[PDB]
Amino acid sequence: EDPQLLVRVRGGQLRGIRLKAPGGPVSAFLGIPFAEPPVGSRRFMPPEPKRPWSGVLDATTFQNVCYQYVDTLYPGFEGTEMWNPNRELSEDCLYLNVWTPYPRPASPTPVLIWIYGGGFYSGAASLDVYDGRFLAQVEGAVLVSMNYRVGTFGFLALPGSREAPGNVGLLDQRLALQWVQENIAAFGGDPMSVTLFGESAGAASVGMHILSLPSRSLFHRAVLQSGTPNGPWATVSAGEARRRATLLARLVGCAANDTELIACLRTRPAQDLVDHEWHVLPQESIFRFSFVPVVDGDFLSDTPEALINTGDFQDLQVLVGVVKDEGSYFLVYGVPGFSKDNESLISRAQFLAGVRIGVPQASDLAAEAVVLHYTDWLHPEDPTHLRDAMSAVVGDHNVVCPVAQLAGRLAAQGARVYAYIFEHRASTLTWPLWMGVPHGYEIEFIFGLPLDPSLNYTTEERIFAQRLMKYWTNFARTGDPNDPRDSKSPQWPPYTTAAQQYVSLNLKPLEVRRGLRAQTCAFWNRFLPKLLS
Amino acid sequence: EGREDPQLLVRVRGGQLRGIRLKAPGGPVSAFLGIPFAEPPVGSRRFMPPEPKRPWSGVLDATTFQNVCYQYVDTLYPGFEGTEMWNPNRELSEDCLYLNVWTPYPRPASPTPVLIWIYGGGFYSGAASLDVYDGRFLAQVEGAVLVSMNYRVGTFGFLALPGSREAPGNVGLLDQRLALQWVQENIAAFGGDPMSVTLFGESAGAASVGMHILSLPSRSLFHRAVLQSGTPNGPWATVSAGEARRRATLLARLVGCPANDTELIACLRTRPAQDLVDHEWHVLPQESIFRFSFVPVVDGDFLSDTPEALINTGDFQDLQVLVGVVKDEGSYFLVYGVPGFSKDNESLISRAQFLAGVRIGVPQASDLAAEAVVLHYTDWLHPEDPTHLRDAMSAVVGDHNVVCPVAQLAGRLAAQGARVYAYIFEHRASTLTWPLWMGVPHGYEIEFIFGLPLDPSLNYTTEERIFAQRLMKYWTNFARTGDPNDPRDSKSPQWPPYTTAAQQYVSLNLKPLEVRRGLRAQTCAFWNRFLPKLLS
Numbered sequence A: 001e002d003p004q005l006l007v008r009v010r011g012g013q014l015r016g017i018r019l020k021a022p023g024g025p026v027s028a029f030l031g032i033p034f035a036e037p038p039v040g041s042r043r044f045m046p047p048e049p050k051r052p053w054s055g056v057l058d059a060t061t062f063q064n065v066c067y068q069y070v071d072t073l074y075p076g077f078e079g080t081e082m083w084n085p086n087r088e089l090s091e092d093c094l095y096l097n098v099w100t101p102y103p104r105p106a107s108p109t110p111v112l113i114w115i116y117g118g119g120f121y122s123g124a125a126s127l128d129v130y131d132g133r134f135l136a137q138v139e140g141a142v143l144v145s146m147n148y149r150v151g152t153f154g155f156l157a158l159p160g161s162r163e164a165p166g167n168v169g170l171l172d173q174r175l176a177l178q179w180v181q182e183n184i185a186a187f188g189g190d191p192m193s194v195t196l197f198g199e200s201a202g203a204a205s206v207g208m209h210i211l212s213l214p215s216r217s218l219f220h221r222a223v224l225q226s227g228t229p230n231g232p233w234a235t236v237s238a239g240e241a242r243r244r245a246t247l248l249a250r251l252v253g254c255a256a257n258d259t260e261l262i263a264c265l266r267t268r269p270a271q272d273l274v275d276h277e278w279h280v281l282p283q284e285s286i287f288r289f290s291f292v293p294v295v296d297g298d299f300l301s302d303t304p305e306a307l308i309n310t311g312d313f314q315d316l317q318v319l320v321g322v323v324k325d326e327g328s329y330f331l332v333y334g335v336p337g338f339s340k341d342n343e344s345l346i347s348r349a350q351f352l353a354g355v356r357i358g359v360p361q362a363s364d365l366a367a368e369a370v371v372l373h374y375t376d377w378l379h380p381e382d383p384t385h386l387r388d389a390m391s392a393v394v395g396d397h398n399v400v401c402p403v404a405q406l407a408g409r410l411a412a413q414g415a416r417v418y419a420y421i422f423e424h425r426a427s428t429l430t431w432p433l434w435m436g437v438p439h440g441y442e443i444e445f446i447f448g449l450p451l452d453p454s455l456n457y458t459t460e461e462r463i464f465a466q467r468l469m470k471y472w473t474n475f476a477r478t479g480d481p482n483d484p485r486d487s488k489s490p491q492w493p494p495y496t497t498a499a500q501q502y503v504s505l506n507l508k509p510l511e512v513r514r515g516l517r518a519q520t521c522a523f524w525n526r527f528l529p530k531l532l533s
Numbered sequence B: 001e002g003r004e005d006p007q008l009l010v011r012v013r014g015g016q017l018r019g020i021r022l023k024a025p026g027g028p029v030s031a032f033l034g035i036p037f038a039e040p041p042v043g044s045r046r047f048m049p050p051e052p053k054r055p056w057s058g059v060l061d062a063t064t065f066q067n068v069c070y071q072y073v074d075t076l077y078p079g080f081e082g083t084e085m086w087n088p089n090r091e092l093s094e095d096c097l098y099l100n101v102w103t104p105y106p107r108p109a110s111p112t113p114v115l116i117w118i119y120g121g122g123f124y125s126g127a128a129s130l131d132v133y134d135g136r137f138l139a140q141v142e143g144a145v146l147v148s149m150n151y152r153v154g155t156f157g158f159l160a161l162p163g164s165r166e167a168p169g170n171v172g173l174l175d176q177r178l179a180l181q182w183v184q185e186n187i188a189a190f191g192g193d194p195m196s197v198t199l200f201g202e203s204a205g206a207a208s209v210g211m212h213i214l215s216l217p218s219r220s221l222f223h224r225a226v227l228q229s230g231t232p233n234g235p236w237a238t239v240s241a242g243e244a245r246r247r248a249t250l251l252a253r254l255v256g257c258p259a260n261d262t263e264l265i266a267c268l269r270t271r272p273a274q275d276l277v278d279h280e281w282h283v284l285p286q287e288s289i290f291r292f293s294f295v296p297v298v299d300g301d302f303l304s305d306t307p308e309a310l311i312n313t314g315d316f317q318d319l320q321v322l323v324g325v326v327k328d329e330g331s332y333f334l335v336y337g338v339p340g341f342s343k344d345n346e347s348l349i350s351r352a353q354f355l356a357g358v359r360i361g362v363p364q365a366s367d368l369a370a371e372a373v374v375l376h377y378t379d380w381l382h383p384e385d386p387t388h389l390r391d392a393m394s395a396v397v398g399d400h401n402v403v404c405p406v407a408q409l410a411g412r413l414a415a416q417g418a419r420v421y422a423y424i425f426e427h428r429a430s431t432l433t434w435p436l437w438m439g440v441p442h443g444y445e446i447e448f449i450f451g452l453p454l455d456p457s458l459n460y461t462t463e464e465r466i467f468a469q470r471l472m473k474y475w476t477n478f479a480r481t482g483d484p485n486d487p488r489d490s491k492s493p494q495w496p497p498y499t500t501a502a503q504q505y506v507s508l509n510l511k512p513l514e515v516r517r518g519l520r521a522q523t524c525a526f527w528n529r530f531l532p533k534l535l536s
């Protein structure tokens, strides 16, 4: 056997596998169990630390994907499949993955911990897009990724009940966080330098760890990509959670006590739960998800907004960002007149129709406010503008403005913030051009995929991917994405409340801009709330 | 007669006039001044609709300006030209219904298109005799027949107890209508063409013009319209009947005037004119700017419905209107009310002062509507910059009151059949006496349109003369033909009509015409489209 592939952790012995990255080998350990399989009566329950094992456990292969809805809108299409599960579905999914350089680091390496997205209803650490070999190999990072329970299995809550207190998916993450503290040293990783990063639902979990005291001792830095704990989609109230749980239970046939109800749910095949997962939304919406974290006054003392509005972030360091076209991706998923197979030019009417969807909570008047604000009064009926507007609304509503809000809140309250906007459209992107740089297409670059010679990316992009892996790791190492030996380019300045500087991430060297949709986000973050209050 | 100038003696329906030959830079003009067109609206005719002037005997000397209609006089800035130039320059009297006529010298042989000017001044002030309204240049240089007229302002012109016989409302507007009638009967005696009459006016004058377009009995008295920095629609140009009554009654109390409306009015008719003026500003519902106590009332008579209603639903194929604004419609008003602001400093305000100012500048806005205003005009990169705030404050006031109503008007008119030409006037006079920060304020296009820079003794620059002349060509071409362009100077930039499809309009300044798209389009969607929903 190969010594560089045998590791003893607190629970037993593991055998990793030696993988070939373009530039050299890396040691990988996949399918590492961090919890007792939360199946049977353990459904909806917090996770328990995994029992010790005998012999040498094989950790050379990806474990199962947590049970979730699978998308089927464009069957066999790379643009959607790249996010679908690539291993069997199982409730038995509590496993993590560690990549490290080969030979494993000589001195304690900073740790990256990735948390996936998928709107709290899908996702997996086995996705090719999340391949950790490149960062480990090129930047010599130790990189960790866990599976956590999504959808009903991870976030169905009957608040205040003992048998379904909610947030267990986030507990699954918190427990892998712990695992890394107890075990990562063995792989050469530095438990004293752990950066979390994540996108979409993932960025919000990161945020929620920032905001939950029990977690603030498991990491030292965060990166939130295209997602926040605050905002319209990442949390529900206890009353809203209770509502959906109860509704679902009704939907599969379970009207009495908390204990009785959940008991019956526990006796239901996975696909039954997923079969109705979607039917419990309060409105015909987009960028809305059925089972998400709940404000329980436990994991979350209060709402993320209350929490960011008054937290003390004296000792925090954070990288926050969006892409150029946060909204596009979502429109093809049920917004009348949109499709990836035509340029989706819309009429004024469909534009109105579509606003009541991307802002499901909006009053009649609140919606009119949006429409008037995003209409280009020079070309109020121009089909291209109307389409592009629809995207902007949805992206600004759900991502850009919430992010602007968090940055502003953090910076103002002591935190050290770096903000980007990601502006480069993949050469091999399979979505139409009208969607621009969609939600989730910075990831491949951060993870270093363009170095995969066979992915047919251009050289410019290979160079670009390398530049980001640096930023991200320099951040992990130092809390500052700036090369301490660079050099080009103009240096990435911290986001502040006074100047509000962020940078564009594109093929050209860094350019500094001021104000993250300042005027438009003022409208979302400052005025609209009055309009509904 | 017999030894006078045979070229200064004309007859009108009321009798014989003797006018005066005036000198202008380029030659002589004929001027007839203080021609009475109505019986003096005094004593028991105070507040009443004007009665047509009764013929006189002998030749009436029409060589000097008549009395200015009784009005409040600005004292904010004593002896300062900036303000003085708008103050009455003849004795104040309730006997003030007189018009003026300027024509070439000698008078034209073929019928000449006629320009009728109507002064602004909030309906609280204004005189056709101010220097800035001198027809001598348009007359001499373009061969225009120019008519300007006095009309009752303040209480005397617009105080109304709606529904009553003694104070029906709008008599100020009726004075004007009477002068238009006068032109239709008499203007041919001076060589003017009654088949070709063009109204024009600024601020309240502009609003006035709007109101004749909108008022059926006026729409045979003219053929074309110009509206400078004012509109019949908007926040300040009109009040409901309920609100007019509210203010009439309030004024009465303030002056001791407690057969119901009859008794009330009768008492008011016994008050010195000066006591009425002394109390005019107290009937305002809120601390404000760009609001005036006594303006036209929506009576369902002169004005059948509200101006807003009428422009929304009208048919204006036959209408040729030229409209526009100045770069800085709002600056002038700030120094008369908004704490922080003054002509004698650079008026850099704080955020606090800006929020306080928005309430004043938008007096009828709820707390929520005001937040909306403040969030729109705030620059969220620099929400505390004193210079930005100073200029946003100016822009709230300008947009709300002029630029957006004008935008609203052009939009509805074009959409409904009318030829509209729109402009923005961007040139600050080298001679302007206000501070730089005010930009090109409300009213400082007038001197150029009337051609005052041609007066050599006014110390304007050569460019400004060329420029003043260009603008007279535009105005006077539009008067002639309904189109401001020149068929003969065809190579020069064209001035396209404003259309809902392209919202085109031109910049007016020392440089050749530039065409632009969209009258503060986005910001006016706010004022014109959203804000009304925020309260509906």
Ligand SMILES: CCN(CC)CCNS(=O)(=O)c1cccc(C(F)(F)F)c1
Residues within 6 Å of the ligand: A076, A077, A078, A081, A082, A083, A086, A128, A129, A444, A449, A455
């Ligand atoms: C990094 C993103 N891609 C591109 C290299 C990874 C692989 N595509 S896939 O896993 O998402 C996959 C796997 C199997 C089938 C299909 C489909 F083509 F049918 F869609 C796709």
Ligand SMILES: CCN(CC)CCNS(=O)(=O)c1cccc(C(F)(F)F)c1
Residues within 6 Å of the ligand: A071, A083, A116, A117, A118, A119, A122, A199, A200, A286, A287, A329, A330, A333, A438, A439, A440, A441
């Ligand atoms: C990890 C990033 N994304 C891809 C960009 C994963 C899936 N997209 S989504 O969850 O964020 C999403 C996107 C669009 C529609 C829906 C649906 F719920 F309506 F189906 C979900």
Ligand SMILES: CCN(CC)CCNS(=O)(=O)c1cccc(C(F)(F)F)c1
Residues within 6 Å of the ligand: B086, B120, B121, B122, B125, B202, B203, B204, B289, B290, B291, B292, B332, B333, B336, B441, B442, B443
């Ligand atoms: C119409 C011609 N203007 C030129 C700008 C003369 C000034 N009168 S005002 O209505 O425009 C005006 C000007 C300043 C203050 C006020 C007040 F009503 F608030 F007092 C009114």
Ligand SMILES: *[C@@H]1O[C@H](CO)[C@@H](O)[C@H](O)[C@H]1NC(C)=O
Residues within 6 Å of the ligand: B457, B458, B459
């Ligand atoms: C114009 O200029 C002359 C000096 O060239 C000056 O004496 C005169 O007072 C000025 N008049 C005005 C109107 O300013």
